[PDB]
Amino acid sequence: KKPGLCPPRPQKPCVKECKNDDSCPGQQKCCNYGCKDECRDPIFVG
Numbered sequence: 001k002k003p004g005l006c007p008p009r010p011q012k013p014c015v016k017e018c019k020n021d022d023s024c025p026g027q028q029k030c031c032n033y034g035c036k037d038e039c040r041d042p043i044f045v046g
Helices: none
Strands: 029-032 037-040
Touching: none
Parallel strands: none
Antiparallel strands: 029 037
16 A cells, blocks of 8 residues: 555545555545545655
8 A cells, every 4th residue: 555644534425536545646545434435645644
């Protein structure tokens, strides 16, 4: 996977943007929020 944590998001809209982190560009992760999979910039614990 890619490092970092997924950021907090609202649960909707129920879109699916991605299969896995590699679906997403650059450092972005494929983050699940229930009914939603969204590409997000991660939060690094630094």
